[PDB]
Amino acid sequence: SALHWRAAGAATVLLVIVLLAGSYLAVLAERGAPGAQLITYPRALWWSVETATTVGYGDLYPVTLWGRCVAVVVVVAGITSFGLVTAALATWFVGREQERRGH
Amino acid sequence: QVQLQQPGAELVKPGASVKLSCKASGYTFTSDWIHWVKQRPGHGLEWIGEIIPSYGRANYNEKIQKKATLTADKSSSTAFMQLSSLTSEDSAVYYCARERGDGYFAVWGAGTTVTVSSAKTTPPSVYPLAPGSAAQTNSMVTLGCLVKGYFPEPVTVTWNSGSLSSGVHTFPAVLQSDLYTLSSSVTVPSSSWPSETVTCNVAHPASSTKVDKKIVPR
Amino acid sequence: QVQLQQPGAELVKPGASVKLSCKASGYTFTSDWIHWVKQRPGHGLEWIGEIIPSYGRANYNEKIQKKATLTADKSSSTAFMQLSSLTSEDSAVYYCARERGDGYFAVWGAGTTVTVSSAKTTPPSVYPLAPGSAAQTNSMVTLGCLVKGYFPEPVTVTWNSGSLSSGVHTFPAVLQSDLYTLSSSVTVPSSSWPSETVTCNVAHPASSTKVDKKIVPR
Amino acid sequence: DILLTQSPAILSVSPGERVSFSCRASQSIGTDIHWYQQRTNGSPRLLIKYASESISGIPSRFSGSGSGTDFTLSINSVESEDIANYYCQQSNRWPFTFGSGTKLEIKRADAAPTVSIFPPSSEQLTSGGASVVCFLNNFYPKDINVKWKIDGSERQNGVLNSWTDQDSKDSTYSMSSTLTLTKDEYERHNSYTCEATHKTSTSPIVKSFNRN
Ligand SMILES: [K+]
Ligand SMILES: [K+]
Ligand SMILES: [K+]
């Protein structure tokens, strides 16, 4: 269908991939750093979801450079993807409002 | 079946350097980490380090002098640990374990007994042990076998290729002039012997020797 | 009115298994949780587990051997607790409480005295206790009644169907050869007796028996 | 690093009782603790993961509880097969660490040893040596003495002993005394004997044999 709905879909699939890759890379970057908690996959995945949604619980976060880099990619992909949906919903509303104006 | 396989023993001269192996089997995920744990006689478990095969990245327990180096052959699903410049302090059983990236070691290898010594590998001498003709017998009879003069540890003593498990005691070896000696005992109903043959199998890894010795009345 | 109702007692043989009940009434929300607390003689309160009726989901105190199982009949608003394979350790008073999902137990049941014993249920023998003709009297008089030879605990002693509360003492039972015995006392103005009848009601749950015994002068 | 303290180091329980192993972490770690069992000369075996999750293949009598810094591994009605060392391990923070471990010890009923003396091997003598072996099997308490007497006279030179840990089959102990001397020394004596002195009998148990 329309570009905005495809982009939304694409963004979602992409986000889910970043989430998974992010979980795997966080563990890899963090293991080896004393005091690190982002070291098992199940919670790292919870961490990536937390991060991508910016929910801010603060129960887990990276302590290494590479882990922080992985964090930036994840949050940014999350902010962007959700902003994309917002933009897609606006395109939907703007298009329907034009119709409701018989023009 | 055995998911992790390690050679039973390795003998190393001071200053020398051995490479232990760990062949894995069963489900293999990319998220799997292989750990190595050190257990000195009497003492407890000490984490050495870890490695993730699907990347070759390894981490080490930095609280202890670093004597290890980990690598992994993705092809043959084998983990390797390079220990270098060993001393008496480095003699112990080294286990390897598999962790599915979720924090616990679901399965461990049988462990490799690394002995750092200048001595020479010496296979054991297995001598039977049957009662004397003067000793009476109760509802049960006690037989045994003397695994003597071997080096280095360990030795795995079994009875009837594992068939006999109930009634078996294998004592801890003892060192007397760079050569170990121990004795294993087995007890069966007095009636069942010697009609039902009784044999002691003795495998000694350091010299790749496994020998039998049937126990017949004197 | 009584929001939680539990049977006063249950007798269980070692290894046996009883199912205690808790009938609720009053405001009933979907968010309500029913808890069960165990109190061994002398000791304090011990949380056993919980259940949410509007879902049937239950949780247990995992720090203690799990001997309970909770279920709930949404229709009759009744909570059930299945205790199995009991021992002397499991004998105690089991309370049930209602929690509005906000952390505290607003209301508790009267509790069920579970006694694990091989013994046999024995109703009590109520004997009156009036002064002797030789004993003088002050501004008050002391009467009583002997609830004797019952099993298992407990027994609820009241005076004049609850009408008399001031001046009453019921002593703790005592066990002598698998049979309990206790005595309750009551004190009224010496003038008020025996013109104003004085009676002791004795309910004994384990045998579903409640009996009266008026106290008349000898 | 996270310190995992396991105290007491040894637990003495009676057969059938309920035992509780303790594990205290130096800082809060949720429920990220795991319990392993290691029998004499065997390798570690996972018993409980994440503080309280049962593992498949483990007796239902094993369980764990706790969260934060205090953890407990419990065994309802212990039994000989449970005799071993128990370690806790944490995966909350890097690196993973292990507690120092606690040995479970069962206090069973007393039992007198089962002595058995053995003359050297025919094929042994050939090599130029002789070893007289004596077994003190399945006794309890673990305290026991073994005395060697060659031709009526108490011997002490050339006698090595060895003691097994508490057996995981019957909660008992066993010991092996071995008198070793050249074929000559051996060939120059008549009767060899072993006397086991043990709490179960004021009079020592004895077993002998004559070289001819
Ligand atoms: K936010
Ligand atoms: K926060
Ligand atoms: K926003």
Side-chain angles (χ1 to χ4, degrees), chain A residues 2-95 97-102, chain B residues 1-4 6-22 24-39 41-42 44-45 47-54 56-62 64 66 68-73 76-88 90-115 117-119 121-128 130-132 134-135 139-162 167-174 180-195 197-212 215-218, chain C residues 1-4 6-22 24-39 41-42 44-45 47-54 56-62 64 66 68-73 76-88 90-115 117-119 121-128 130-132 134-135 139-162 167-174 180-195 197-212 215-218, chain D residues 1-59 61-77 79-102 104-106 108-121 123-124 126-141 143-144 146 148 151-153 155 158 160-168 170-187 189 191-211:
Chain A
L3 175 57
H4 47 103
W5 292 130
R6 296 166 74 68
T12 292
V13 159
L14 224 172
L15 177 68
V16 183
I17 292 173
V18 170
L19 295 185
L20 307 171
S23 299
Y24 182 85
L25 298 163
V27 167
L28 205 72
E30 299 295 295
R31 284 209 182 181
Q37 280 189 305
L38 213 39
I39 58 179
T40 50
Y41 302 120
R43 72 186 52 179
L45 184 51
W46 168 232
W47 167 77
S48 57
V49 157
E50 285 186 314
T51 300
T53 60
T54 72
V55 74
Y57 290 147
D59 50 328
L60 301 166
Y61 51 82
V63 299
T64 69
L65 171 62
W66 291 124
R68 281 161 182 179
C69 279
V70 170
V72 171
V73 172
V74 177
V75 69
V76 171
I79 297 172
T80 297
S81 295
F82 287 107
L84 189 140
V85 166
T86 292
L89 287 175
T91 301
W92 178 43
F93 294 161
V94 165
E97 182 61 357
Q98 290 311 302
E99 290 172 41
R100 172 180 168 290
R101 293 188 182 187
Chain B
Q1 70 314 317
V2 166
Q3 315 183 201
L4 259 45
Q6 311 176 69
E10 295 285 316
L11 206 185
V12 177
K13 302 177 172 300
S17 166
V18 64
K19 167 173 288 193
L20 317 188
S21 64
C22 170
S25 78
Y27 287 121
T28 297
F29 304 117
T30 175
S31 50
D32 293 332
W33 290 76
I34 295 300
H35 296 269
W36 290 85
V37 182
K38 165 179 174 187
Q39 188 167 48
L45 311 175
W47 185 74
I48 304 164
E50 73 198 318
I51 193 166
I52 179 175
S54 63
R57 167 53 182 283
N59 305 315
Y60 308 87
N61 173 350
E62 39 179 277
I64 62 182
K66 189 182 179 179
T69 303
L70 315 183
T71 71
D73 186 287
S76 49
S77 291
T78 303
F80 297 83
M81 178 177 79
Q82 184 68 293
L83 298 165
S84 76
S85 299
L86 312 179
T87 74
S88 72
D90 302 309
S91 294
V93 175
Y94 290 87
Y95 293 106
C96 76
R98 177 199 280 154
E99 186 233 342
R100 300 300 192 203
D102 50 341
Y104 58 76
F105 318 99
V107 68
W108 305 65
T112 295
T113 295
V114 178
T115 320
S117 172
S118 294
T121 301
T122 301
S125 301
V126 194
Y127 300 123
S139 66
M140 299 290 285
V141 50
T142 303
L143 311 171
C145 68
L146 164 59
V147 182
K148 186 173 194 307
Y150 67 71
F151 188 85
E153 279 256 49
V155 289
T156 297
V157 174
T158 54
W159 291 88
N160 278 356
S161 305
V168 177
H169 306 311
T170 300
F171 298 89
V174 305
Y180 292 116
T181 293
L182 66 72
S183 173
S184 177
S185 97
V186 56
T187 282
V188 299
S190 50
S191 62
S192 76
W193 189 71
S195 73
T197 173
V198 170
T199 320
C200 80
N201 321 121
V202 178
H204 178 276
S207 61
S208 310
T209 59
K210 187 171 184 175
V211 308
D212 291 330
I215 303 302
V216 305
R218 286 167 66 76
Chain C
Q1 70 314 317
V2 166
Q3 315 183 201
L4 259 45
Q6 311 176 69
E10 295 285 316
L11 206 185
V12 177
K13 302 177 172 300
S17 166
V18 64
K19 167 173 288 193
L20 317 188
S21 64
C22 170
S25 78
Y27 287 121
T28 297
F29 304 117
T30 175
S31 50
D32 293 332
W33 290 76
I34 295 300
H35 296 269
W36 290 85
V37 182
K38 165 179 174 187
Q39 188 167 48
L45 311 175
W47 185 74
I48 304 164
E50 73 198 318
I51 193 166
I52 179 175
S54 63
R57 167 53 182 283
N59 305 315
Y60 308 87
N61 173 350
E62 39 179 277
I64 62 182
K66 189 182 179 179
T69 303
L70 315 183
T71 71
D73 186 287
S76 49
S77 291
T78 303
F80 297 83
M81 178 177 79
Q82 184 68 293
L83 298 165
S84 76
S85 299
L86 312 179
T87 74
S88 72
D90 302 309
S91 294
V93 175
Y94 290 87
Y95 293 106
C96 76
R98 177 199 280 154
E99 186 233 342
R100 300 300 192 203
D102 50 341
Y104 58 76
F105 318 99
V107 68
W108 305 65
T112 295
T113 295
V114 178
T115 320
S117 172
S118 294
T121 301
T122 301
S125 301
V126 194
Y127 300 123
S139 66
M140 299 290 285
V141 50
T142 303
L143 311 171
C145 68
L146 164 59
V147 182
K148 186 173 194 307
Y150 67 71
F151 188 85
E153 279 256 49
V155 289
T156 297
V157 174
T158 54
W159 291 88
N160 278 356
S161 305
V168 177
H169 306 311
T170 300
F171 298 89
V174 305
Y180 292 116
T181 293
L182 66 72
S183 173
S184 177
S185 97
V186 56
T187 282
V188 299
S190 50
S191 62
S192 76
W193 189 71
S195 73
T197 173
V198 170
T199 320
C200 80
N201 321 121
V202 178
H204 178 276
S207 61
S208 310
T209 59
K210 187 171 184 175
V211 308
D212 291 330
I215 303 302
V216 305
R218 286 167 66 76
Chain D
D1 293 42
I2 288 176
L3 180 62
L4 253 33
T5 299
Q6 287 190 269
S7 174
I10 298 183
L11 263 284
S12 292
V13 65
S14 292
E17 284 180 359
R18 157 109 171 175
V19 64
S20 289
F21 303 90
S22 181
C23 174
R24 175 189 295 294
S26 57
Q27 50 185 286
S28 190
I29 54 176
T31 48
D32 289 340
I33 203 79
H34 313 295
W35 293 91
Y36 300 82
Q37 177 198 75
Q38 182 176 41
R39 295 198 172 94
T40 297
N41 290 307
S43 64
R45 185 183 181 68
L46 175 71
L47 291 165
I48 298 280
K49 67 180 174 178
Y50 300 101
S52 66
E53 285 167 47
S54 49
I55 306 299
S56 287
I58 301 301
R61 59 238 180 59
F62 273 97
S63 80
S65 80
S67 74
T69 68
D70 283 50
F71 306 77
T72 308
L73 171 67
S74 284
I75 303 180
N76 271 64
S77 76
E79 51 178 274
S80 305
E81 79 159 315
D82 300 326
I83 294 192
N85 284 172
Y86 291 82
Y87 298 83
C88 52
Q89 181 250 303
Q90 70 78 34
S91 52
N92 188 75
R93 287 174 190 274
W94 199 91
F96 290 175
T97 45
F98 290 99
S100 55
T102 294
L104 176 66
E105 167 182 295
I106 309 178
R108 57 156 289 161
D110 304 306
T114 294
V115 197
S116 290
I117 183 168
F118 299 74
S121 287
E123 51 278 64
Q124 199 202 321
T126 304
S127 63
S131 301
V132 193
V133 184
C134 188
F135 292 149
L136 291 304
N137 296 179
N138 303 272
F139 59 83
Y140 184 88
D143 289 293
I144 186 176
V146 67
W148 285 87
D151 277 334
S153 292
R155 182 62 179 295
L160 296 175
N161 297 315
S162 180
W163 301 259
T164 64
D165 267 87
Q166 193 170 50
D167 185 70
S168 70
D170 55 32
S171 305
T172 66
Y173 298 68
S174 294
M175 177 232 271
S176 74
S177 187
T178 299
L179 166 49
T180 288
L181 33 68
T182 58
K183 186 172 69 292
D184 303 314
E185 184 82 7
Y186 173 56
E187 289 300 358
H189 284 295
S191 61
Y192 297 73
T193 164
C194 297
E195 320 197 316
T197 323
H198 183 275
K199 165 183 183 294
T200 51
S201 176
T202 57
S203 298
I205 298 185
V206 289
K207 299 291 186 179
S208 306
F209 96 86
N210 290 56
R211 187 167 54 61

